[PDB]
């Protein structure tokens, strides 16, 4: 179960020349196990994901979900 979410991460203002468009808008695939760390990173950025979805069809299996 990997969750794919699109986040317009709030501007970190960390770009002088360089480029910040790729960081500014992100479409990514995140494992459900690692999604908590992704949420923490989104908190540091300041922007919540506009859209959140999970690739796996069913959210919970009590047993052998893997």
């Amino acid at each position: 179960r990997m969750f794919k979410i699109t986040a317009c991460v709030p501007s970190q203002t960390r770009i002088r020349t360089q480029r910040e468009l790729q960081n500014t808008y992100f479409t990514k695939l995140v494992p459900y196990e690692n999604w908590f760390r992704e949420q923490q990173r989104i908190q540091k950025m300041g922007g919540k994901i506009v859209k959140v979805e999970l690739f796996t069809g069913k959210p919970g299996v009590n047993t052998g979900l893997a």
Partner: protein, 221 residues
Amino acid sequence: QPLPDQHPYGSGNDPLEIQFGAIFPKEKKNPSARPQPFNKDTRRILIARGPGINNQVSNPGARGLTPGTLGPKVFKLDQQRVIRAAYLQVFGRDVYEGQRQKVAEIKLENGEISVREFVRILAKSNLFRSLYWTPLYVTKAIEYIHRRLLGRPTYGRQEMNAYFDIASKKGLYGLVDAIIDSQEYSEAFGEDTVPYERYITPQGLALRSLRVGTIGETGVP
């Protein structure tokens, strides 16, 4: 004399600072060991493969300012060859043709996964384990992985014990994620940059920089 520059655990725990190989001294093959007592929270003096003004000990903020022409090349992904660099840094050599994780792990070209996750995949891969975890005594392996994944040799026991408890309870995969999730990997190398050699121990600089042809004028006026 005062304390030396060796790893706190021992001289043997210092790998040759070479391009690739994990060439550690063996405790028994040619007996050589200088067990010097290192305190709980000492710190190695790590020369910076770059400008010494930019040193994490003195300029802790400027982690991420590029080494520049005074240091290694820094590969960053913009949107290619970052994949090649990640192989050449996580392992050291370009891996053999069958050993490539190939497109199965290289979804980076598509953009699904960031370079931080690509190096995590390579670090947990079975090839990396066989090369740098299975054949090496534990703390020697912890050291070599820290040098390959983070840019720097381990500072002291404050880091070795903290990365040793993780290894004892979670193994190579746990230690790898601890290193790659560390605050320092995000501060330097971010989540877009291939890791690069950020520091070297003084006897690695001795090997590189004091051979005839590299010493130049270094040592006498």
